[PDB]
Amino acid sequence: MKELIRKLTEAFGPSGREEEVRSIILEELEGHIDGHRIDGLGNLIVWKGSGEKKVILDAHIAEIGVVVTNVDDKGFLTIEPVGGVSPYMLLGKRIRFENGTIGVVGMEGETTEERQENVRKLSFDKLFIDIGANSREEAQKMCPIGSFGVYDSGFVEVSGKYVSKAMDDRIGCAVIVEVFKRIKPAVTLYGVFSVQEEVGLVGAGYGVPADEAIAIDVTDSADTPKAIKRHAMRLSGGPALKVKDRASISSKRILENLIEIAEKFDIKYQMEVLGIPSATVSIPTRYVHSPSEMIAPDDVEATVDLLIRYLGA
Amino acid sequence: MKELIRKLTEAFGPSGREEEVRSIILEELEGHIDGHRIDGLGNLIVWKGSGEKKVILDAHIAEIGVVVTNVDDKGFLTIEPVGGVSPYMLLGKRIRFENGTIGVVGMEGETTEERQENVRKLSFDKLFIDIGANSREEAQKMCPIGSFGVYDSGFVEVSGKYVSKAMDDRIGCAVIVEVFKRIKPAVTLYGVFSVQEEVGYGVPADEAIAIDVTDSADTPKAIKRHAMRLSGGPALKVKDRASISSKRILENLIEIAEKFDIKYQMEVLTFGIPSATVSIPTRYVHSPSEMIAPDDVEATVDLLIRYLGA
Numbered sequence: 037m038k039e040l041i042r043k044l045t046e047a048f049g050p051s052g053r054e055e056e057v058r059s060i061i062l063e064e065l066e067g068h069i070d071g072h073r074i075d076g077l078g079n080l081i082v083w084k085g086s087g088e089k090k091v092i093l094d095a096h097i098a099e100i101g102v103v104v105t106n107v108d109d110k111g112f113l114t115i116e117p118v119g120g121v122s123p124y125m126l127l128g129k130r131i132r133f134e135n136g137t138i139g140v141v142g143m144e145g146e147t148t149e150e151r152q153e154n155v156r157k158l159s160f161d162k163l164f165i166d167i168g169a170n171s172r173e174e175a176q177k178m179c180p181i182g183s184f185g186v187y188d189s190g191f192v193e194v195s196g197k198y199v200s201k202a203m204d205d206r207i208g209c210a211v212i213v214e215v216f217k218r219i220k221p222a223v224t225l226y227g228v229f230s231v232q233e234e235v236g237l238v239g240a241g242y243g244v245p246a247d248e249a250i251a252i253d254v255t256d257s258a259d260t261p262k263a264i265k266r267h268a269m270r271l272s273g274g275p276a277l278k279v280k281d282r283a284s285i286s287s288k289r290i291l292e293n294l295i296e297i298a299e300k301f302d303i304k305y306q307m308e309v310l311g312i313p314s315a316t317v318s319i320p321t322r323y324v325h326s327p328s329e330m331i332a333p334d335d336v337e338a339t340v341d342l343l344i345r346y347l348g349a
Numbered sequence: 350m351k352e353l354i355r356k357l358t359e360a361f362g363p364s365g366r367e368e369e370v371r372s373i374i375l376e377e378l379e380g381h382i383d384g385h386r387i388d389g390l391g392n393l394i395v396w397k398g399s400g401e402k403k404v405i406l407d408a409h410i411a412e413i414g415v416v417v418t419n420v421d422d423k424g425f426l427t428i429e430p431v432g433g434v435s436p437y438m439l440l441g442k443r444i445r446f447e448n449g450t451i452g453v454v455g456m457e458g459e460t461t462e463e464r465q466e467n468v469r470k471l472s473f474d475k476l477f478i479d480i481g482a483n484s485r486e487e488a489q490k491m492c493p494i495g496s497f498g499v500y501d502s503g504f505v506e507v508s509g510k511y512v513s514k515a516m517d518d519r520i521g522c523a524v525i526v527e528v529f530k531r532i533k534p535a536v537t538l539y540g541v542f543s544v545q546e547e548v549g550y551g552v553p554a555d556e557a558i559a560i561d562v563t564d565s566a567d568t569p570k571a572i573k574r575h576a577m578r579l580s581g582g583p584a585l586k587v588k589d590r591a592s593i594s595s596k597r598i599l600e601n602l603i604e605i606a607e608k609f610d611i612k613y614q615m616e617v618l619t620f621g622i623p624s625a626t627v628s629i630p631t632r633y634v635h636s637p638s639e640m641i642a643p644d645d646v647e648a649t650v651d652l653l654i655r656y657l658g659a
């Protein structure tokens with residue numbers, strides 16, 4: 037599963053430009069699905085099995101990133117965030133653009149005073165990206181306005197932990213793919229690798245009737261220094277099963293099912309305390325929205341096992 | 350080209366299941382190409398020639414259709430569209446599935462009033478497909494959930510016009526095949542029979558020309574000016590956002606048409622590697638009876654052969 041996670045997390049797929057991720061998902065699923073299609077909205081749907089009960093597993097396919105909004109006379113780029121990228125995570129960082137261009141993020145300010153006031157209240161309008169261009173014309177040919185970029189950071193093993201960009205939510209995508217690769221389904225199983233509308237716009241179950249929908253997401257792992265929170269999710273604590281405050285009767289039934297499956301098959305799990313009946317299963321992740329998101333492989337394996345025990349014959 | 354168009358339009362090839370279309374294309378191209386490959390997504394790429402300039406001709410091989418999304422206790426199928434199938438185009442129509450299973454599309458509504466209400470705002474949730482099964486078990490053996498169906502229509506010649514399903518875009522596929530059959534290329538010529546919409550081609554070409562279909566707006570009450578029409582020739586697509594290089598391809602094609610005396614028409618604006626689009630005027634797009642004029646297809650083949658040939 038390590039190579040699968042490496043490929044999916046390293047793939048280029050900021051919001052709206054996720055074609056490479058869909059391609060990797062389809063190639064990885066070759067010989068393991070009965071069919072696939074893309075719906076009008078861009079969601080990738082795959083399926084396997086013929087059981088009477090129909091179940092959707094849903095993971096988001098986009099990653100956070102940036103988009104070029106301006107090019108100045110000296111070839112420097114202005115950017116804005118796509119998703120939850122903090123400007124503080126971009127300082128001195130490298131960005132990989134869709135066409136392969138690498139850029140360096142710098143901050144405006146010459147004097148120590150100016151730079152210090154700028155970092156104290158850092159905003160995107162104080163950042164720029166250097167792609168090595170010496171003119172607007174050079175930069176426009178290399179990285180036109182509207183170009184998307186992602187963290188130029190890849191997969192690395194950190195003493196048994198896995199670290200990469202875009203664990204949120206490529207690790208969920210990886211869980212679903214791996215379940216499809218292994219499972220002999222007792223259900224009709226759907227995998228949905230879903231898009232998300234920009235905040236401010238109309239938003240999207242999908243184009244498939246089903247009895248249950250399980251979202252495979254990430255959740256913050258609050259097990260780092262000085263974390264002083266009850267209800268804390270931790271690495272190696274297992275899949276996090278979400279206790280939703282306003283959940284329907286049918287949704288609570290799914291949650292209880294998963295608890296029983298986990299307990300009966302000796303699968304580690306933890307309870308996360310904040311239409312198709314739904315449940316959420318999450319991978320505990322450190323440093324969400326950084327270029328170095330971190331998971332514990334045993335949590336991911338436990339999540340795959342939980343789903344296979346629940347849905348497999 | 351008649352038999353080539355018959356075979357390609359009648360072939361079974363909804364999105365994701367185009368094996369028969371690829372087989373026909375390679376059978377028609379045997380002895381006319383230098384090589385081919387099918388990539389991991391299912392794109393079929395062929396090539397011929399060794400000129401320094403590399404040119405791609407692209408057409409997509411999927412046709413519109415339906416996908417089975419449920420089966421009820423009595424064997425009736427629930428369906429969703431794949432591509433631009435209107436529910437009004439399915440009423441009382443036959444659908445063919447991959448193993449040759451034929452189904453009939455029905456609409457819910459017992460009384461005349463219920464049916465009158467349902468056709469006023471027809472939606473897929475009021476449609477079903479009857480494949481002759483008498484139970485879920487019988488239906489699931491023939492046509493499991495996730496099965497794709499296409500129109501159960503075929504090719505017929507109508508007073509010199511060609512009518513079939515899937516002119517969009519099997520007619521573009523046919524154009525590319527016919528070019529490879531006839532051309533002695535001055536370029537290295539690539540033909541890409543694409544499935545790229547499956548992910549929303551490993552050839553570093555200099556130009557790409559998409560061969561597509563465009564609506565022929567020459568039917569009754571069509572009052573749009575500069576409308577595309579049957580027998581007006583290949584429709585050359587005007588692009589507003591186009592690069593200088595993309596505009597150059599379009600200007601090149603206009604010059605070829607005029608210098609070789611090939612009929613052509615300009616598809617006006619409505620408000621990657623350099624590319625242009627050349628389209629076949631087609632009536633009744635997305636119906637089971639898409640209609641082209643063979644002289645437009647021939648003119649399109651000629652345009653590409655004269656642009657790209659030695």
Ligand code: NA
Nearest residue numbers: 375376378379
């Ligand atoms: Na061949």
Ligand code: NA
Nearest residue numbers: 412413515517
């Ligand atoms: Na079609």
